[PDB]
Amino acid sequence: LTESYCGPCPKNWICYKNNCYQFFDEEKNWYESQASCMSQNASLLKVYSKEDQDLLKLVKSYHWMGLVHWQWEDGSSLSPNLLTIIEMQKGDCALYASSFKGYIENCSTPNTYICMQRT
Amino acid sequence: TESYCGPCPKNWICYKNNCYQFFDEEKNWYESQASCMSQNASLLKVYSKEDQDLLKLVKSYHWMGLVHGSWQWEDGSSLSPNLLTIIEMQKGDCALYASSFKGYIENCSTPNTYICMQRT
Numbered sequence: 001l002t003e004s005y006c007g008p009c010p011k012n013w014i015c016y017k018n019n020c021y022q023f024f025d026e027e028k029n030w031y032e033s034q035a036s037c038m039s040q041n042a043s044l045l046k047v048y049s050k051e052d053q054d055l056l057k058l059v060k061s062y063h064w065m066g067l068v069h070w071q072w073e074d075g076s077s078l079s080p081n082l083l084t085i086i087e088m089q090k091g092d093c094a095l096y097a098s099s100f101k102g103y104i105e106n107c108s109t110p111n112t113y114i115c116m117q118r119t
Numbered sequence: 120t121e122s123y124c125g126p127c128p129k130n131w132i133c134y135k136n137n138c139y140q141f142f143d144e145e146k147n148w149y150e151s152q153a154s155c156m157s158q159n160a161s162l163l164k165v166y167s168k169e170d171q172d173l174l175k176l177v178k179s180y181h182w183m184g185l186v187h188g189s190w191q192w193e194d195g196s197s198l199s200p201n202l203l204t205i206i207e208m209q210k211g212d213c214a215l216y217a218s219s220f221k222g223y224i225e226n227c228s229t230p231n232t233y234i235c236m237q238r239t
């Protein structure tokens with residue numbers, strides 16, 4: 001119940017535990033989604049901690065995250081005990097789904113996406 | 120442009136200086152209000168489609184602080200016009216939020232999930 005400020009974030013982004021999130025409903029392939037997040041000084045969702053990102057338990061549907069074949073856009077590799085990766089469509093990219101799941105998806109398939117910023 | 124949000128408690132979502140927390144354990148309206156108050160909060164109050172446009176993203180229906188004068192919030196203020204489309208669902212004196220900016224009239228005794236809100 002102790003209070004603190006969250007961010008910094010742009011005003012139209014969700015802030016949770018100092019990370020900033022934005023949902024995009026216009027569907028794009030994985031590469032175009034990454035390009036969109038970069039154009040907003042951001043990256044596709046990176047999952048690094050269940051505790052600091054427990055809001056992701058509430059994120060429904062299926063959204064591009066920055067995981068590719070596994071490693072993140074920034075070149076860091078997927079840490080253990082974070083995501084359950086399930087095959088869906090033959091491919092080298094992954095969609096985030098609740099709760100802490102990644103569905104493998106062809107990187108060229110259009111999908112909604114989540115971008116994430118941290119300052 | 121970057122700015123700081125809140126303040127909020129750590130396990131709450133912050134958006135445009137308001138704090139939100141979803142509760143998946145189903146409670147009737149009265150128990151839901153009591154739950155938010157124990158966290159120094161209230162049930163969701165809807166006052167602005169701009170300041171609270173994240174509510175367009177909320178899936179399912181959840182207790183908010185609107186009760187039946189007219190419909191009023193827990194804080195005694197009136198529901199502002201042209202904010203919510205009110206729809207009759209059950210015989211009742213409480214309302215559930217649903218996207219986008221709908222309010223379902225609901226029996227206050229029906230268990231539902233709920234949204235607490237805080238603003239320091």
Ligand SMILES: O=C(N[C@H](C(=O)N1C[C@@H]2[C@@H](CO)[C@@H]2C1)c1cccc(C(F)(F)F)c1)c1ccccc1-c1ccc(C(F)(F)F)cc1
Nearest residue numbers: 014023025058059060061132139140141173176177178234
């Ligand atoms: O609504 C729910 N999940 C959304 C989702 O999965 N979306 C996917 C994508 C749509 C657009 O197609 C977007 C977002 C969601 C998730 C996180 C944050 C938000 C936001 F609201 F903060 F932005 C919205 C949801 C689903 C099941 C149970 C509870 C919720 C829920 C989430 C947050 C809140 C609240 F914030 F009020 F505490 C209340 C209920």
